[PDB]
């Protein structure tokens, strides 16, 4: 039942909520990602949806977060990308605005994440080689 | 060569065996999951097989098991579902009968696992953020 406590909301219904409050509803959006001419159209749509999901999972796989919605990384955040306080982002901003503001710097962060994972992978393998 | 020790059996060969003995052949079942009108039909069959496998993998991914044939979850069992003994299930019941008995309570366990995973993920993130 609805009350003063938590709220269920709906699929893509926490968009207006702040980042800190919308970060607890990641599973609902992730779990909903899955006459010959008409057959071609529906098959094309299904294949595109599967390709999109596979690409997202591949990107997560390249990084060290292949099996978790929330994870942590070793590369810090350079101030030049956002130069704003931490509290003002999670408690005073939404995902749509944060996404629009970082849209021009997403590729650089992606490359940094991939390079960091590759370096950590070889460092860990070299360290474990002693055994 | 067959003997008094272990047995190989075949795909879906442990369907009539108990759960305890059938749990050793989890790999054989998992490794076997993977004229214009006829082309459409064949592509439909292949696409459906891929969607089913992706859905199963997605369900496993939402839970705390990225990828492994056997994994553990941090939620206690409720007798209300079965209430049956521990040893009496594994050593005296097959997978089909057990599935038929728990069929009316699968959605509840599926929701509880997701809830526990979300809580565990947020708790782990908060715990790791005190460095």
């Amino acid at each position, epitope marked *: 039942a609805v009350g003063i*406590g938590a709220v*269920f909301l709906g699929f893509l219904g926490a968009a207006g909520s702040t980042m800190g409050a919308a970060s607890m509803t990641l599973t609902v959006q992730a779990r909903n990602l899955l006459l010959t001419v008409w057959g071609i159209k529906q098959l094309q749509a299904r294949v595109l949806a599967v390709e999109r999901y596979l690409r997202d999972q591949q990107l997560l796989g390249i990084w060290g977060c292949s099996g978790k919605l929330i994870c942590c990384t070793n590369v810090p955040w350079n101030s030049s990308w956002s130069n704003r306080n931490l509290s003002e982002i999670w408690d005073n901003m939404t995902w749509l605005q944060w996404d629009k503001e970082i849209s021009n710097y997403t590729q650089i962060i992606y490359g940094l994440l991939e390079e960091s994972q590759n370096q950590q992978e070889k460092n860990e393998q070299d360290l474990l080689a002693l055994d | 060569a067959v003997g008094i020790g272990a047995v190989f059996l075949g795909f879906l060969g442990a369907a009539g065996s108990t759960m305890g003995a059938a749990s050793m052949t989890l790999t054989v079942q998992a490794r076997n999951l993977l004229l214009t009108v006829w082309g459409i039909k064949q592509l439909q069959a292949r696409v459906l097989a891929v969607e089913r496998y992706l859905r199963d993998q997605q369900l496993l991914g939402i839970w705390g098991c990225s990828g492994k044939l056997i994994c553990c979850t941090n939620v206690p069992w409720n007798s209300s579902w079965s209430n049956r003994n521990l040893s009496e299930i594994w050593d005296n019941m097959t997978w089909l009968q057990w599935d038929k008995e728990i069929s009316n*309570y699968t959605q509840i366990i599926y929701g509880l696992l997701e*809830e526990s995973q979300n809580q565990q993920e947020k708790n782990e993130q908060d715990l790791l953020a005190l460095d």
Partner: antibody
Amino acid sequence: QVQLQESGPGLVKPSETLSLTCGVSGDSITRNYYYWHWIRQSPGKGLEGLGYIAYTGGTDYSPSFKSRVTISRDTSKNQFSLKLTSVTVADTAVYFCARERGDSYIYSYDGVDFWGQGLLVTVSS
Amino acid sequence: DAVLTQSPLSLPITPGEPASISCRSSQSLLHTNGETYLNWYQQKTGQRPRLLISQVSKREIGVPDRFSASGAGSDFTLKISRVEAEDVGLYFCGQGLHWPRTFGQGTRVDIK
């Protein structure tokens, strides 16, 4: 399984404070997504919800009884109590204590899982 | 205030034929998130009520399969596929969406 049991006096004079207490066993009052209500079954007029207490300690009272009902909790012994001032003859009813379902962030759950046993309170000298 | 109204007031029946009960609401119970919040309750003579069906159509655990319900928006109905002699008592329909919580007046079922 969870068990609910109310405690208090079954006879109260008119025009003063009235207090009832409902214990909880088998589960903790600090559960992640559950609420605790106080419902009374009056004869003929039907059920009435006095109020409830959330897991966070926040109280909520109905508009017709906001000026007369008060709910408190004591997490150290796993129980909660209700205080009702300015009682009248019309308040004579069977008071119940129950636990419903909270809507979690991920899924939605509704329905009252368990009910108490009910205690009749007579407002008369 | 969202009040609930049940009909018929009384349901005198005999063991051997089905039964049906109806419950309506003054306001729409379809919450903005797309989920209904109506539940059905059964209460015996001098006993605590029991939750039979939840979320409109969800047979609570440990309840007989003989009970069923359906509905959407503002019309709901409770139907019994197979009624026995121990189904004598009151039936209550309540909503857990609007504040304060409300319950129906209570329709009693008794043998004819």
